[PDB]
Design a protein around this motif. Structure first.
Motif: not given
Length: 90
Positions: A67-90
């Motif tokens: 959100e700050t634009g200062g760095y890139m995230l990588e997100c993964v599609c976990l799904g969990n039957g609910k379209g869930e995802w999470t991100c971390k800085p890489i």
């Protein structure tokens, strides 16, 4: 003669048990031709995420600015039957 299912989005016919992807708008559905004498098709997004106008299978990844634009995230599609995802800085 072999029975089929017609998909109005892909515009193709499929035989019974065939599996395929159906692009519709911003999403991709995982579809299966059932038939039942009426071209019955079962489609599912239970196993996908749909984020940022893209479609992801379970374990697929994408890159997104923080959100700050200062760095890139990588997100993964976990799904969990609910379209869930999470991100971390890489």
């Amino acid at each position: 003669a072999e029975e089929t299912c017609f998909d109005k989005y892909t515009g193709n016919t499929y035989r019974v048990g065939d599996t395929y992807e159906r692009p519709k708008d911003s999403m991709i559905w995982d579809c299966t031709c059932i038939g039942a004498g009426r071209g019955r098709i079962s489609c599912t997004i239970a196993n996908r995420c749909h984020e940022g106008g893209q479609s992801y299978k379970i374990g697929d990844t994408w890159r997104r600015p923080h959100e700050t634009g200062g760095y890139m995230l990588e997100c993964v599609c976990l799904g969990n039957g609910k379209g869930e995802w999470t991100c971390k800085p890489i």
